[PDB]
C-alpha cells in the first residue's frame, strides 16, 4: 500500500519534525517549501 516512511534524504526531498515535533518539509529540486497536508511521513512523494 501507499504507507509512508520517516525518510531522510540529507537535506530536502525529505519530511520531518524538528526538536518540538513539528514537521516541516521540504524538496531538493528548488529547496522548495509547502503547506501541503503535513506529514512526518513519505512515500517517497506520493498520496500518503
Given at each position: 500500500g501507499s504507507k509512508?516512511?520517516?525518510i531522510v534524504l540529507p537535506?530536502?526531498?525529505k519530511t520531518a519534525r524538528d526538536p518540538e515535533g513539528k514537521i516541516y518539509y521540504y524538496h531538493?529540486?528548488?529547496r522548495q517549501t509547502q503547506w501541503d497536508p503535513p506529514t512526518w511521513e513519505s512515500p517517497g512523494?506520493?498520496?500518503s
Open positions: 509512508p516512511k520517516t537535506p530536502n526531498w531538493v529540486i528548488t512523494d506520493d498520496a
